[PDB]
Amino acid sequence: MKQYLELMQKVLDEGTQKNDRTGTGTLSIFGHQMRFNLQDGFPLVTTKRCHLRSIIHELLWFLQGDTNIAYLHENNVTIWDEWADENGDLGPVYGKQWRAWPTPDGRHIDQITTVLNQLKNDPDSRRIIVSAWNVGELDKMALAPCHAFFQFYVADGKLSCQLYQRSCDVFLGLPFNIASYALLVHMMAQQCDLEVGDFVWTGGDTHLYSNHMDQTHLQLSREPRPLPKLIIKRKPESIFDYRFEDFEIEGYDPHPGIKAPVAI
Amino acid sequence: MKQYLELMQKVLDEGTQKNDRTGTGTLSIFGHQMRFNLQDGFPLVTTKRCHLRSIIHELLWFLQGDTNIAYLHENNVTIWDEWADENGDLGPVYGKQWRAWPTPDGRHIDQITTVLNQLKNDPDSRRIIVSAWNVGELDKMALAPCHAFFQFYVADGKLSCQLYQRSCDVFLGLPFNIASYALLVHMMAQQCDLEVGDFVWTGGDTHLYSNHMDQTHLQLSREPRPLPKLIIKRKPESIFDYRFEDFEIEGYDPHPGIKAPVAI
Numbered sequence: 001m002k003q004y005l006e007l008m009q010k011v012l013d014e015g016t017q018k019n020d021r022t023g024t025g026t027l028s029i030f031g032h033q034m035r036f037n038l039q040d041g042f043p044l045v046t047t048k049r050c051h052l053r054s055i056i057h058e059l060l061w062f063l064q065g066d067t068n069i070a071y072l073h074e075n076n077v078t079i080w081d082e083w084a085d086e087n088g089d090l091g092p093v094y095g096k097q098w099r100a101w102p103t104p105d106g107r108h109i110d111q112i113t114t115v116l117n118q119l120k121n122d123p124d125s126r127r128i129i130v131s132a133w134n135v136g137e138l139d140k141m142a143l144a145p146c147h148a149f150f151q152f153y154v155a156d157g158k159l160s161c162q163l164y165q166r167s168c169d170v171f172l173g174l175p176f177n178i179a180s181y182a183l184l185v186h187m188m189a190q191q192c193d194l195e196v197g198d199f200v201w202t203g204g205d206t207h208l209y210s211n212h213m214d215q216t217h218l219q220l221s222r223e224p225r226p227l228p229k230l231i232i233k234r235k236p237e238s239i240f241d242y243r244f245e246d247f248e249i250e251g252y253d254p255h256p257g258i259k260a261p262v263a264i
Numbered sequence: 265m266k267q268y269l270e271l272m273q274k275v276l277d278e279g280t281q282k283n284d285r286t287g288t289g290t291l292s293i294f295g296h297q298m299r300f301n302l303q304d305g306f307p308l309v310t311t312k313r314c315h316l317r318s319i320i321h322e323l324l325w326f327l328q329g330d331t332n333i334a335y336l337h338e339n340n341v342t343i344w345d346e347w348a349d350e351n352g353d354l355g356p357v358y359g360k361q362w363r364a365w366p367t368p369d370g371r372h373i374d375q376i377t378t379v380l381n382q383l384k385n386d387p388d389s390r391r392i393i394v395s396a397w398n399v400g401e402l403d404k405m406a407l408a409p410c411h412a413f414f415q416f417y418v419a420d421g422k423l424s425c426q427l428y429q430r431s432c433d434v435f436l437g438l439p440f441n442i443a444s445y446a447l448l449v450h451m452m453a454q455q456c457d458l459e460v461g462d463f464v465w466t467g468g469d470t471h472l473y474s475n476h477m478d479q480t481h482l483q484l485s486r487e488p489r490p491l492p493k494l495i496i497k498r499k500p501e502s503i504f505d506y507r508f509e510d511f512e513i514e515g516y517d518p519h520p521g522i523k524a525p526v527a528i
């Protein structure tokens with residue numbers, strides 16, 4: 001995508017070399033914002049094939065509050081395997097905090113349901129927020145949430161969403177992170193009878209790993225294609241009732257897939 | 265400031281009218297980012313006088329973990345009066361979460377001290393984050409945090425910081441919110457022996473209240489002045505040991521103050 005390649009180019013031109021947790025080494029910039037009007041098309045990267053099965057199943061898995069990888073395996077998705085313990089557990093990551101953030105006084109808070117209530121009863125509210133950054137539980141997590149905090153916004157009958165992502169692996173993560181949230185926006189707007197508006201991505205430490213340099217130069221030589229169209233076939237009873245096959249991505253014609261090593 | 269007036273102009277040209285919690289009505293945009301190189305000068309608005317006493321004392325008050333307004337009153341700062349209960353209490357807002365976020369298992373976490381430890385021992389970490397958005401306690405707060413979540417970043421010997429602000433009152437709030445965080449950056453870099461880098465501001469629902477329209481047109485006719493210089497006179501033992509008079513703002517020559525009604 002246009003915005004995606006401009007970002008890739010910017011890290012190459014303007015990033016400073018940095019050490020990082022993994023030992024891999026990176027080129028990194030700090031702070032960047034991109035806007036996607038979800039009306040122009042579904043923001044799925046076309047300059048390499050992205051694995052939709054994985055993107056979609058992760059989202060469904062988040063919406064369940066499942067933090068164990070068994071559901072991913074039943075569905076042949078292995079993108080979380082490097083970080084699970086032998087029981088296949090990741091600790092109270094994403095979905096646990098979305099569905100059941102633990103309070104100090106014993107309760108559990110379902111932010112997703114909270115958010116549908118706000119969008120159904122108080123669309124102008126400026127507090128329509130989901131956070132994964134539960135400070136009290138970071139140390140139980142296999143990995144701190146990279147996509148940490150997001151806000152919904154309604155104006156003129158359209159649903160918008162902004163994501164704060166503290167740490168972005170531009171080559172491997174960002175293409176999923178974008179498709180994934182764009183999906184949630186479509187699902188949420190459907191549930192709430194809204195049009196889709198913009199998805200705004202905001203990054204903190206936005207980086208390209210040092211052993212993604214040939215892959216990056218390869219993808220930047222590619223010309224982007226027309227964006228696909230997302231079709232949801234059925235309107236489920238609830239945001240928690242989507243099935244993988246309710247989604248149709250039509251007109252998706254990427255350049256070939258490009259393999260790159262994961263930073264563990 | 266340049267970036268500040270361009271933002272003000274953008275909400276006027278591009279905002280949609282919105283109802284809001286207060287009943288006031290606003291022009292609102294969603295998602296905007298501005299960068300301030302803290303080396304070019306201290307980003308204190310010059311097109312109207314800003315009350316430094318208030319900006320500084322609020323920050324000091326946050327660093328204490330005080331959520332009661334008594335400390336502000338001892339120091340003649342009344343910017344929190346509209347929201348306190350009769351005992352002068354605001355609930356577990358900003359400073360409570362910065363200094364003593366309560367865990368579900370009984371503990372309290374001091375994110376500020378956590379952050380100095382990360383900056384002193386692991387500057388490349390991409391998890392140097394403070395959050396005020398404690399979901400478990402939002403309902404105890406007099407007001408949900410507007411400036412909710414912020415991240416530090418070190419590269420080339422310089423300290424940077426990005427703020428996610430879910431709700432920005434552009435006329436009244438933003439000029440404080442910016443001065444205030446720019447201050448924290450200077451304090452933190454001093455404590456950590458770093459140079460100041462950039463302060464990056466990221467907004468969600470970024471708005472101009474409808475009864476700030478004449479004030480806004482008035483301030484946009486003003487020409488911005490040279491930015492002041494911030495001088496810290498002493499290097500205290502700790503981030504918690506700053507006193508109001510350790511700070512000198514030199515070269516600050518604003519246009520006159522402009523009064524506007526607070527949205528309660």
Ligand SMILES: *[C@H]1[C@@H]([N+](=O)[O-])C(=O)NC(=O)N1[C@H]1C[C@H](O)[C@@H](COP(=O)(O)O)O1
Pocket residue numbers: 021022143144145146147167168169170172173174177263390391
């Ligand atoms: C993290 C990631 N995730 O864990 O799901 C994601 O969704 N997107 C990412 O970009 N992602 C990256 C950012 C970073 O390169 C590593 C996490 O490392 P730290 O930032 O050191 O925690 O994964």
Ligand SMILES: *[C@H]1[C@@H]([N+](=O)[O-])C(=O)NC(=O)N1[C@H]1C[C@H](O)[C@@H](COP(=O)(O)O)O1
Pocket residue numbers: 126127285286407408409410411431432433434436437438441527
């Ligand atoms: C909120 C504020 N604060 O409570 O300290 C601040 O520091 N900056 C703000 O801009 N500010 C504004 C945003 C909004 O206009 C109101 C809060 O209202 P909700 O967004 O409806 O909670 O104060």
